[PDB]
Each structure stands twice: as C-alpha cells, then as structure tokens.
Design a protein around this ligand. Structure first.
Ligand code: XG4
Ligand code: MN
Ligand code: MN
Length: 430
DNA sequence: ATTATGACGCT
DNA sequence: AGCGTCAT
C-alpha cells in the first residue's frame, strides 16, 4: 500500500512534429499549405515512395510506405514534394536543419533527449516545481491549456470535438488539489501548461505545428502524444492508465510492435496491455527474460523508469542507399563509385557537424546487403575514421568489404550488392 | 522495388 | 566487435 511506489515522481513530455517533412515543404512552398500533400523519395519507380503525409491527404487513405502512383489513385489531387537528390541519392539535409530549429527552441525550456528527427523528450520535473513556486497555490485556468486533452475525460454525467475537449478539461481542473505542491496530477497539469508554452514558441518561431504527450514517463508521454494529433497535446495521468490499457492492443506500446509483442500475445493468450497485470513479475521474466519481464510488469501498471537522456544531437551520422532488383551493383567500378558518393555526403555532414558541435567521429561502420539476403544488413565491418576525407573513407570501406566479393573475376562483383551504408560513430570532443 | 536512417539490446 | 530488433 503506502510503500508501493507508483511511478509518479517525474513529469515527462514527448513533443512530436505533425507530418514533419510535409510541414517543412509547406513552409517553403505556400501553394502546398492546407492541401492533401505528401513527401516522396525518388520518382521513376511507381511515382516514388511516400514517407510523410498531410492530415488532409490521410483522410483519403494516403499513408507512408505507399507508392505515389497508388496514392494518386486514392487522392487524384494529392500534391507531392520530392526529397532533394544529391550525388545520386536522397539527401535529407533540409529536414535535419529544420529539426535543429525545433530542438534549439525546445532546449530553452529544459534539457531534451532527441529521439528522432522530429521528436524529443523533455523532463519537466524541475521546471514544474519552479512554476508551482511561482503560482503560490493559485489554481490553473483552463485558458492556460487551450489545446490540451485530458485522456479519459469527460466521464459520467457534447456534440462538438472542442466542446468535449473543454468538458474533460473542466472536469479535470475542478478535481485538482492545488494546495499540494507534491500532487502528481497537479504536477502533470503544470507540465501541460509549460508544454503549451513550448509548442506556442515552436509554432511562432518556425511555423511548424506539433503535438505532445504529458505523463510520468517516456512510454506514456509518447502514447499520449498520438491520442489527439494533430496540433493538440494530451495529458495521461497515472489514474487514467487502467481504463486506457484495458482496451490497448499490446502492439501500440513502443517496443512491443514486433516479435516480442507477438510473443507476449501468443504465450500468454492475451490481447490488451491491461491483461498483463494478472501475471507475477517472475512469470513475465520466465517468459520474456529478466529485463523485459520487469519492464512489462511495471509498464502494464503505468510505471517506467527509462530516463530522459541529456542528448540534443544524434549519436551517429550515417548515409545509406538501397540498390533494388536490376539496379544492384555488380561491378567493382560500380561499388567504388557509390561508396565514394556515400562517403562524399558523409564527409560534408561530418565536417558541418564538427564545426557546429565541437566533436569528431572516430569509427566508420560499413554495412552491405547482398542479393538474396532478406536481412537488413548482410555484413557489418568497422574501421578507424581518422580523417574527414571522402576518398580515404571510401577506400577504407572498400578494403573492409572487398573480401565479400565471391567472383573470381577482378572486375565483377558477385553476388551483387543491394545496399551500401556508411555510418560514422564513437564521437569525441574536439 | 519501400527507403533512409537511427536507436538501441545481445552475446 | 558483429548481429538482431524496433522504429518509421
Ligand atoms: N527517409 C525516411 N524518412 C522517414 C521514414 N519514416 C518517416 N520519415 C520521416 C518523415 C516524417 O515526416 C518524419 C517524422 O516521422 P513521424 O513522426 O513518424 N511522422 P510525421 O511527422 O510525418 O507525422 P505524424 O504527425 O503522425 O507524427 O520522419 C522513412 O521510412 N524513411
Ligand atoms: Mn511527427
Ligand atoms: Mn516522430
């Protein structure tokens, strides 16, 4: 009872940009704004592959992973923006730079953990304590939470979406105990006030809209963020978890959408996250390993301890290109030329990183996939990265992979290469 | 012929 | 170190 810690000692937020690459292109080209729009890579095969979709286009069924030609079948008026091509490959620099814009704004409010190109976690515990001190026991006005949903509310004792949002927020605020500076629900609420401010700053200073989740840990904050996209934020309280999880398919939790989640479902004969509560920690560890079992035991109760890492910058800088079907690389000249193209993009990104961030990569990882291998990487080899020189980097990558070529002929490459991947790692302060 | 990444955990 | 998983 009293000693049963409830995982309520942090306030954590997840901010995720809405249809990010689309918004970057819509900012640049006003003709794309408020339109069914998608961003594609390449064009020749099937119109190119969609990687981002505006909410207007989603209404027609357009999704990521879909070929543009098929998306145009669903949405004949769909507008498309193509990712830049440089050195024969997709070049995502514009979106990385836009990401830095957003990350730098978020860092004004708190130390952030860059989780992807378009989203970051925020540990707001300390900022919340500060704002609570300033509030001096003053209640929180609904006016300070103009885009916030309270998950699970309204409940009990109404036709529009905004009305339901406000009804739930009123029910939440009316139940708050604002004289207790240690109440977790009050802390989450102040966290949501701060996140409104953060999202307002992002939109004012970049033009980009985002959604956010506020809860007591990273998993719940991420889940919360997705509940009311776009352009809204959602508060998931500890108390909302039993009802939320009682009908939550296990695969919606970050980390359980793959083989492990399928094994939870099949071994235990359950469907929803809430059903996990009936098992002991030891039973879950027996099926899924010590670490996974402890994580599942706490997570189905709303408890997760993974810290918000103080990391605004990516840990690696990588360049990759697939060569599908008849485009697979079958000669040594081809392999060398594309290793050089990848290495030249890598050199440019690494040099900019060194200038911006006062660090140097020290390890080069070379990954290839070979024809007939379904795995992502057929082979990974590391070597030293001692100079930011594309020619050296590509020569070294060739040296570490050249023993893969089973061809007796010096010129041919067999079996052909369907992917090249260069990734700079193990950064050191310079 | 989804593609381009990037984060990890395992052994 | 190299491989596998998850993510999108
Ligand atoms: N190159 C590449 N980029 C991708 C891929 N998947 C996503 N991206 C890029 C394009 C995405 O814009 C960006 C962020 O990914 P999300 O947050 O998962 N999706 P979004 O922000 O679009 O919509 P929502 O409002 O639902 O969050 O990452 C991919 O497979 N490949
Ligand atoms: Mn997003
Ligand atoms: Mn995202």
């Amino acid at each position: 009872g009293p000693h049963m810690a409830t995982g309520q000692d942090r306030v954590v937020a997840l901010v995720d940009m809405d249809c990010f690459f689309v918004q970057v292109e819509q900012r640049q080209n006003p003709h794309l704004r408020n339109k069914p729009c998608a961003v594609v890579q390449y064009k020749s095969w099937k119109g190119g592959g969609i990687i981002a979709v505006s909410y207007e286009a989603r209404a027609f069924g357009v999704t990521r992973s879909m070929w543009a030609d098929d998306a145009k079948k669903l949405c004949p008026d769909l507008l498309l923006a193509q990712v830049r091509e440089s050195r024969g490959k997709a070049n995502l620099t514009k979106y990385r730079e836009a990401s830095v814009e957003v990350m730098e704004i978020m860092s004004r409010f708190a130390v952030i953990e860059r989780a992807s190109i378009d989203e970051a976690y925020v540990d707001l515990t300390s900022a919340v304590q500060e704002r609570l001190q300033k509030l001096q026991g003053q209640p929180i006005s609904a006016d300070l939470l103009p885009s916030t949903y309270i998950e699970g509310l309204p409940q009990g004792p109404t036709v529009q979406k905004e009305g339901m949002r406000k009804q739930g927020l009123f029910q939440w605020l009316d139940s708050l105990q604002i004289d207790n500076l240690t109440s977790p629900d009050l802390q989450l609420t102040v966290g949501a006030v701060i996140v409104e401010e953060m999202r307002a700053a992002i939109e004012r200073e970049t033009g980009f809209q985002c959604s956010a989740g506020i809860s007591h840990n990273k998993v719940l904050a991420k889940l919360a963020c997705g509940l009311n996209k776009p352009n809204r934020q959602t508060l998931v309280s500890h108390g909302s978890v039993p009802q939320l999880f009682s009908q939550m398919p296990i695969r919606k939790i970050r980390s359980l959408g793959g083989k492990l989640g399928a094994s939870v479902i099949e071994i235990l004969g359950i469907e929803y996250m809430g059903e996990l509560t009936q098992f002991t920690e030891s039973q879950l560890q027996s099926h899924f390993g010590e670490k996974n079992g402890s994580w599942l035991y706490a997570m189905c109760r709303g408890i997760e301890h993974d810290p918000v890492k103080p990391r605004q910058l990516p840990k690696t800088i990588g360049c990759s290109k697939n060569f599908p079907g008849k485009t697979a690389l079958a000669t040594r000249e081809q392999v060398q030329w594309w290793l050089l193209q990848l290495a030249q993009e890598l050199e440019e990104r690494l040099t900019k990183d060194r200038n911006d961030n006062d660090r140097v990569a020290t390890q080069l990882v070379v990954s290839i996939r070979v024809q007939g291998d379904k795995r992502l990487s057929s082979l990974r080899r590391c070597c030293a990265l001692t100079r930011y020189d594309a020619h050296k980097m590509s020569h070294d990558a060739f040296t570490v992979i050249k023993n893969c070529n089973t061809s007796g002929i010096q010129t041919e490459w067999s079996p052909p290469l369907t992917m090249l991947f260069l990734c700079a790692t193990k950064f050191s302060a310079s």
